[PDB]
A paper describes a structure:
The structure of BRD-9327-bound EfpAEM at 3.0 Å resolution showed density for BRD-9327 on the inside of the extracellular vestibule with its long axis parallel to transmembrane domains between TM1,TM5,TM9 and TM10. The binding pocket is comprised of T70TM1, I73 TM1, V74 TM1, S191 TM5, V192 TM5, L195 TM5, T324 TM9, V325 TM9, I327 TM9, G328 TM9, L329 TM9, V331TM9, Q332TM9, S338 TM10, A339 TM10, A342 TM10, F346 TM10 and F349 TM10 residues. Mutations identified to confer resistance to BRD-9327 in M. marinum include A339T, G328C, G328D and F346L3 (numbering as homologous residue in Mtb). These residues are each part of the BRD-9327 binding pocket. Mutations in A339T, G328C and G328D appear to directly interfere with BRD-9327 binding, likely accounting for resistance to the inhibitor. Our MD simulations demonstrate that the phenyl ring of F346TM10 partially forms π–π interactions with the benzyl bromide of BRD-9327; a leucine substitution (F346L) which confers resistance would abrogate this interaction. The side chain of Q332TM9 above the compound is displaced upward in the presence of BRD-9327 resulting in shift of 2.6 Å from the apo state. The head group of PG1 below the molecule and lower in the vestibule is displaced downward away from the compound. The location of BRD-9327 suggests that it will partially block transport of a substrate if it were to pass through the tunnel toward the cytoplasmic side. Also, it will inhibit the dynamical motion required to complete the alternating access transport cycle.
EfpA is an essential transporter in Mtb and categorized as a member of the QacA (quaternary ammonium compound A) transporter family. Mtb EfpA is a 55.58 kDa protein with 14 transmembrane domains (TM). EfpA TM helices organize in a typical MFS transporter fold where two bundles formed by 6 helices (TM1‐TM6 and TM9‐TM14) are arranged with an internal twofold pseudo symmetry. Although EfpA has been suggested to play a role in Mtb drug resistance, its essentiality in axenic culture implies that antibiotic efflux is a secondary role, and that the primary function of EfpA is the transport of a yet-uncharacterized biomolecule across the Mtb plasma membrane.
Numbering used by the authors:
A (entry chain B), B (entry chain A): 49 to 518
Write the structure that this text describes.
């Protein structure tokens, strides 16, 4: 009971953040019908959460040291649960933006502390391997349940979908309080100036990136904000040289195996993000599956991923992360190749969707556990805070960068085959066939990126003694 | 009985040529101890066959159009059979060279005609697909038989190893005489100047490439012969402009999927040749399996390849050559990755050699049939000669080019890990471990080359109607 409550409590914010993220995507069309926030306002509800999630994440890593990791986990999760209630009673556009900003602040504080808790509470060995498998398991369970919950009761209203995080948020706070021990260490002074410039640089960079498409990549407010991001980043690096208790220990990423590992998760997160988005839009637009049936159809992904994670936890103590990452990616590579050739519209479910999803899930499950263990391998307790934050930050940062290239390929080929860059709701059934072949073509580009990820996975070079022993 | 005698007869030269090559490899050390031809002559027995095999191949493609494809097949195989008897009674170094030259001339005349017989004897449809599988099947049966026969009765004498080709050589002539019909077409005049310059250019290019390492890449006989190859090649291209009945129809390779397909088999053949040479030296030097037990240990490869060829022959009428080539290569990719991580000296047979060999065999067998069908797809009868000759030539030309890069990587890492560039018979068991890990490393570079082959295979764009229908 003590072990089971511990792993469930630690992985709670992974369940909440991913489940809330998918519910937001499902409920975004109906927010437009009610609030009438226009097409400009459609992205602010998504970018508001992302803006402060990425802005405050590096602050949230070191915050667990100077206040405590367990208290930081409850405080961060509690703010998220409260923010979801305010989000579900939004009056207008302004209230919904402030509510989404508050959720990201709560999730920015708690997400790094969740992975840092994995590193600290469970001693290296089978306990950390099992905890890592469960931590990555609830990441996938949340997203599917978001589709099912979002797709199930979105008909009655979109407000009820957001209130569903309150029962889950409260039970995780109850489990965390009654199953985690506040290890009383000496509190460490926070880097005031170092954290201010990091938060300023990250928020400004995200603002410029998000606001570019809306207003223009050279208008002046985009590059103007990017100039402030560059200025803060340079001043942050200069100040961190002589900084005590740094927000980012740059000296730490000189091991020649931390850089390789942290470069791998950066692009591996980009491949995973572009894969979920592309498959999500393809299932929604081409197949027309709807959220409820799409969510119920992805249950085999969760069961398949659970098998891959469970197997890999046992295998990580005998095989190095190098082979397991390549072995898992190899399975995913076949699943995406199969889905790149036999994925026309109207194909049945069992032979064409159950198999590649199940095979791909085991590949993702197998490769996630070794990467997570090697990310948090051999750091300490005074430097595990920021290192966990950077692993989350690089995972999320690689999403838009790779996906931007992929979406350009979808758009380029959709015009080449004959198609329109408008909404799917107006298509000629031949422009819609062009879009069908554009998505299937871009899946090869995602496969090309996955090859590069495996290319630098060959430089990881961690033995299983460092990551999953003692 | 007519179909079985036909397919066995047509692919007989592939059995002879491949089997003879492996027997010469196995028997080379014992030829040295008797004839005492020194290290300089060690390669002249191998390069003499290759020098004239590549030199006369392009002339042998057009030779069936002016004399007859059935007559050319019997004459070529008969000269190979007669040359093997002379090769087995060699008195000294000079006569062994002349005997190997005569074998290559017979193989150069028969090999292009053998693949031309596949295209012309069997109508497009299930007959050609089954004949292609058998044609490729007996290439691998021949290689493994060369190990088993070479390694079995090498003990008594190496001369008996070369006489084993006479019972097989005679029966393939008998089958070809009583199972192939001489389709009486009008004989087409031969290109005199074009064939002469093509033979001169190819022989000089091979002579310069072969004699380079022995004498040096800049001595004057290397670039001097290379100068003759370039002068002949340029003159050959000039006279082929106004050539009636050309030896190489350059205009034919402008379809944008003939170039892609023929570039695939060039580098696909280079990948395959480096894979057998690297695995052959690894098994010989590191594992110390000896020829007889190595040959018996590769019997699962023949059975595994037979399953792959048999499955692919039925699947090629429903799936395009694009997906089958990628599907076959994907299986080979996993086998080579598995062998690149869990292949140390001293590992057992069943878990570490039977599985990667069987999986790799099915992968190669699956990919071989679609490539062969698309290579000979949509040509005719008056241009099938040179097209098949070019396909055999590019397959054989890609071997040394890719293998030169792979061997350079093997050597470089052997020194990096701490090793010696001498023979394996003097090793310190720590320099042999460095060589062991060098071969395992170079298997990754072969896997990188296979990926590039897969990328080019996506541009084939043949439907199954063009290659395996009607
Ligand atoms: C230079 C700038 C750095 C590049 C990224 C900028 C922000 C992306 C904005 C796009 C908004 C929506 C998409 C999105 O972003 O999604 C990925 C992820 C969570 O997914 P979402 O919650 O959006 O849900 C998924 C739905 O599917 C969406 O369709 O968001 C992020 O956190 C973005 C990563 C950046 C945060 C961390 C670092 C920021 C600062 C850069 C470091 C150095 C700067 C200093 C100089
Ligand atoms: C991977 C990082 C490793 C380092 C990780 C180390 C760094 C520290 C963090 C550790 C914890 C994170 C791991 C969590 C598990 C991995 C995430 C995941 O897997 O989560 C499920 C996902 C939705 O949840 P998420 O919100 O997490 O999504 C991803 C995030 O957004 C961005 O990472 O859903 C899917 O799997 C999509 C389906 C997969 C398809 C399989 C292939 C079939 C292709 C056929 C084509 C058919 C259609 C045609 C189409 C054209
Ligand atoms: C101490 C350490 C070191 C010190 C420090 C030393 C210095 C650090 C080195 C950094 C990286 C250098 C190169 C990185 C680029 C990637 C390599 C690459 O580009 O080459 C990939 C290679 C060949 O192919 P290419 O054709 O590209 O090469 C030829 C030309 O590029 C084409 O012209 O392929 C492979 O063998 C990879 C095998 C695995 C792939 C199959 C499975 C998928 C992988 C995992 C996915 C995980 C998903 C996770 C989701 C959960
Ligand atoms: C520029 C020159 C072109 C590049 C290749 C040159 C010849 C390789 C000599 C090396 C001798 C031994 C290895 C070898 O070659 O092996 C591959 C194959 C059959 O294998 P082997 O029988 O050797 O047995 C395998 C044992 O394992 C060996 O260890 O040989 C060949 O045919 C070589 C290909 C070239 C022939 C066709 C075209 C030649 C002319 C080039 C075209 C344009 C020129 C005009 C300008
Ligand atoms: C492929 C061309 C397609 C276009 C073809 C179209 C063009 C026209 C011609 C068509 C007919 C040719 C096809 C014949 C079949 C393919 C050849 C083949 O397959 O023949 C068996 C081969 C020996 O016969 P060959 O003499 O023909 O050899 C090749 C030639 O020399 C050059 O092509 O043996 C082997 O398979 C080696 C073992 C394979 C290993 C599998 C992966 C395991 C890796 C684990 C590593 C463990 C050790 C570590 C190591 C470090
Ligand atoms: C029209 C008119 C135009 C003319 C026609 C075009 C011709 C060829 C150009 C492209 C050829 C190379 C393509 C790209 C490449 O080179 O890359 C492969 C690709 C990307 O990955 P990379 O990481 O390399 O890209 C990194 C960056 O290039 C550098 O950073 O991967 C894939 O999708 C391939 C999927 C299949 C591979 C798995 C199965 C094995 C394949 C079959 C082997 C058969 C064995 C032989 C047995 C017979
Ligand atoms: C008609 C069909 C057969 C055409 C498809 C063949 C090519 C047009 C495509 C198929 C896959 C593509 C490759 C897939 C992956 C990549 C990796 C890509 O790099 C990235 O994804 C980098 C992402 C980043 O910027 O962070 C560069 C192009 C490349 C080599 C692509 C080059 C073009 C390729 C070979
Ligand atoms: C010892 C540890 C640190 C592992 C490090 C190995 C990697 C640095 C190797 C393994 C796979 C290699 C790649 C495999 C194949 C290729 C294709 C190669 O070009 C070819 O087409 C090779 C075949 C040829 O034409 O000769 C260019 C380098 C590259 C990307 C290689 C670059 C170096 C890589 C990444
Ligand atoms: O995120 C997952 N899907 C999606 C991601 C998206 C997206 C849509 C989806 C959908 O699925 C979907 C939604 C409504 C109706 C039909 C399908 O539209 C914007 C970009 O992001 C996902 C969750 C769990 C498991 C696998 C996945 Br692919
Ligand atoms: O040609 C095949 N092997 C070889 C190729 C070689 C080579 C050696 C071998 C051997 O095997 C071998 C020979 C003697 C003792 C032990 C092993 O030395 C020079 C370079 O070429 C082969 C044949 C059929 C199936 C698979 C293969 Br890999």
């Amino acid at each position: 009971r003590s072990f089971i409550a511990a792993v469930i409590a630690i992985g709670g914010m992974q369940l909440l953040a991913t489940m809330d993220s998918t519910v937001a995507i499902v409920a975004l069309p109906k927010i437009q019908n009610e609030l009438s926030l226009s097409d400009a306002g459609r992205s602010w509800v998504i970018t508001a959460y992302v803006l402060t999630f990425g802005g405050l994440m590096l602050l949230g890593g070191r915050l667990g040291d100077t206040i405590g990791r367990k208290r930081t986990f409850i405080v961060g999760v509690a703010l998220f649960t409260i923010s979801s209630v305010l989000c579900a009673v939004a009056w207008d556009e302004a209230t919904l933006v402030i509510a989404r900003l508050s959720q990201g602040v709560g999730s920015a504080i708690a997400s790094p502390t969740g992975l840092a808790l994995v590193a600290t509470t469970f001693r290296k060995g089978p306990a950390r391997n099992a905890a890592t498998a469960v931590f990555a398991a609830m990441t996938a369970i949340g997203s599917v349940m978001g589709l099912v919950v979002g797709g199930a009761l979105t008909e009655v209203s979109w407000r009820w979908a957001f209130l569903v995080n309150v029962p889950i948020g409260l039970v995780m706070i109850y489990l965390a309080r009654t199953a985690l021990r506040e290890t009383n260490k000496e509190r460490m002074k926070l880097d005031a100036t170092g954290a201010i410039l990091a938060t300023l640089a990250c928020t400004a960079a995200v603002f410029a990136f998000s606001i570019g498409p809306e207003k223009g990549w050279m208008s002046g407010i985009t590059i103007g904000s990017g100039l402030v991001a560059l200025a803060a980043a340079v001043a942050f690096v200069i100040v961190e040289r002589t900084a005590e208790n740094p927000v980012v220990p740059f000296h730490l990423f000189r091991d020649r195996n931390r850089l390789v590992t942290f470069s791998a998760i950066l692009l591996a997160g980009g491949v995973m993000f572009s894969l979920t988005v592309c498959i999500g839009l393809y299932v929604q637009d081409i197949l027309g599956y709807s959220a409820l049936r799409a969510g119920v159809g992805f249950i085999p992904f969760v069961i398949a991923m659970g098998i891959g994670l469970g197997v890999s936890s046992q295998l990580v103590s005998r095989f190095s992360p190098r082979v397991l990452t390549i072995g898992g990616g190899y399975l995913l590579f076949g699943a995406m190749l199969y889905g790149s050739f036999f994925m026309h519209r109207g194909v049945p479910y069992f032979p064409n969707l159950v198999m590649p999803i199940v095979v791909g899930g085991i590949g993702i499950g197998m490769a996630v556990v070794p990467l997570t263990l090697s990310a948090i391998a051999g750091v300490g307790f005074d430097q595990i805070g920021p290192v966990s934050a950077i692993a989350l930050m690089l995972q999320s940062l690689g999403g838009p960068l790779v996906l931007a290239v992929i979406q350009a390929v979808i758009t380029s080929r959709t015009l080449y085959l004959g198609g329109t860059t408008g909404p799917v709701k107006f298509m000629n059934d031949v422009q819609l066939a062009a879009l069908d072949h554009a998505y299937t073509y871009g899946l090869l580009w995602v496969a090309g990126a996955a090859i590069i990820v495996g290319g630098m996975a060959l430089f990881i070079g961690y033995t299983p003694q460092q990551v999953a022993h003692a």
